[PDB]
Amino acid sequence: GQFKRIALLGMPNTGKSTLFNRMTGGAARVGNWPGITVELLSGKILLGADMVEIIDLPGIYDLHGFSDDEQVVRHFLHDNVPDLALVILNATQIERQMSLLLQLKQLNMNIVVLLNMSDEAKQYGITIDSRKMSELLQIPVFQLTGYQEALQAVTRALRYPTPGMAENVRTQLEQDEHIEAEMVRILKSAVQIP
Amino acid sequence: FKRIALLGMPNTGKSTLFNRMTGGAARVGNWPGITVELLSGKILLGADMVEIIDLPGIYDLHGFSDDEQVVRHFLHDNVPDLALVILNATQIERQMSLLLQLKQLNMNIVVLLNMSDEAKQYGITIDSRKMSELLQIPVFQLSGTGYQEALQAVTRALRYPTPGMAENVRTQLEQDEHIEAEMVRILKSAVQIPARL
């Protein structure tokens, strides 16, 4: 059968854990990954004779930033190029959070977008046309009860290979790694911290 | 008429340095490419009057806070002759990234390491000559002390402008502008966000 990985990605405080715990049925465990030293929650799911591992990556603001979390996410993506990036956006904060999605899109990753808290957003009169957003992005977009339709898009995206994706992704993260390398070099060489 | 953009994270002493540099004679002003107002004034460096602009403190050059959009738009449409980058010496590990992001733009830069006595008090030692050698950017330390040496470095940095510099800076900023343009296009077509009532 197949073995594939989903990276759950978005900005912080976006309901990511809850969706994660639902998707992995509460049975996620912590684990150590190559390229990073922090521990991450992941859970494995059997679908027929196929397996998918879902990893909850910490919320971040800029894919090309240098906070600890952003470095973690970038190193994880570089070293463990997931088969699908599942990007969770907060429907109520859509204007602020689109930037992360678009940055990920620029890597040419395989992406599905879940617009979370769609009801609460309606209460502020916020309406999103999923179909039009989807056609502009050329990425599937689902509003969360929408769960079933999302799952359908998730499993669909896992059935096909993405030849050359890993090399595209690594390439597009290069300018950030050059900066990290400069930083280590300069600090090691020119700065003493107690 | 030659422009110096003060760039740095919040709480790096930028505004106190600004006020000292412009004699408290700063005024608010409008600039091409931005919808907000900025403080700017003049300083006599050598024989030329130079305009100094205080950009709001930011954490990430490629982030999407309001202040980070302002900085990028200002820089794109008003490429300074010098970016005067102020880092807090006590946070050198956490602030170096903003400097290196600006360096990647190919801006003309001078670095000032402020709060140098505070850093020394906490046992943080910075070899500014070494750091300068490694960056290939002038680096000077401020406490009061270091101010005149800083102004001299700024003056020299305005000599011999590098041909093609502005064109390179704009180019390096336009992927950020493509993301922003995509955001605008998508919000207008697919999202309704009503103001209150």
DSSP code of B55?
P
Which candidate from B93, B100, B191 shows the least CB-CB separation from A193?
B93
* Partner-chain contact B130 A189, CB within 8 Å: yes
Annotated binding site of A for Mg(2+): 21, 24-25
- The letter for the amino acid at A28 is A
> A1-194: CATH homologous superfamily?
P-loop containing nucleotide triphosphate hydrolases (3.40.50.300)
Tokens standing for B166? Answer: 């502005």
Contacts of A73 in chain B (CB under 8 A): none
Residue A52 to residue A49: CA distance in whole angstroms: 10
* Partner-chain contact B134 A62, CB within 8 Å: no
Crossing angle of helices B165-190 and A130-137, rounded to 10°: 150
Phi then psi dihedrals of residue A13, to 5 deg: 55, 50
Which candidate from B63, B185, B193 shows the least CB-CB separation from A62?
B63
DSSP B107-163: --EEEEEE-HHHHHHTT-EE-HHHHHHHHTS-EEE---TTHHHHHHHHHHHTSSPPT
Contact A97, A11 (CB under 8 A): yes
Tokens standing for B125? Answer: 């030692």
Contact A19, A8 (CB under 8 A): yes
DSSP code of B24?
T
Contact A84, A111 (CB under 8 A): yes
Of the candidates B88, B89, B79, the one whose C-alpha atom is nearest the C-alpha of residue B55 is B79
Residue A19 to residue A34: CA distance in whole angstroms: 25
Contact A125, B194 (CB under 8 A): yes
Tokens standing for B122? Answer: 């906490």
Q: B1-197 in CATH: which number?
A: 3.40.50.300
Residue B186 to residue B165: CA distance in whole angstroms: 33
Q: Are strands A127-128 and B139-141 parallel, antiparallel or unpaired?
A: unpaired
DSSP A118-175: HHHHHHTT-EE-HHHHHHHHTS-EEE---HHHHHHHHHHHTSS--TTHHHHHHHHTHH
Phi then psi dihedrals of residue B145, to 5 deg: -65, 150
Contact B90, B119 (CB under 8 A): yes
Contacts of B189 in chain A (CB under 8 A): 129, 132-133, 136
Q: In residues, how long is chain A? A: 194
CA distances from B172 to A103, A126, B28 (A): 15, 34, 28
Pick the residue of B62, B120, B136 with the most A CBs within 10 A to test the interface with A by mutation. Answer: B62
CA torsion A136-A71-B102-B184 (nearest 10°) is 20
Residue B84 to residue B5: CA distance in whole angstroms: 6
Contacts of A60 in chain B (CB under 8 A): none
Residue A101 to residue B186: CA distance in whole angstroms: 12
Which candidate from A102, A126, A186 shows the least CB-CB separation from B96?
A186
CA distance, residue B24 to nearest chain A CA (Å): 34
CA distances from A5 to A118, A191, B45 (A): 26, 40, 58
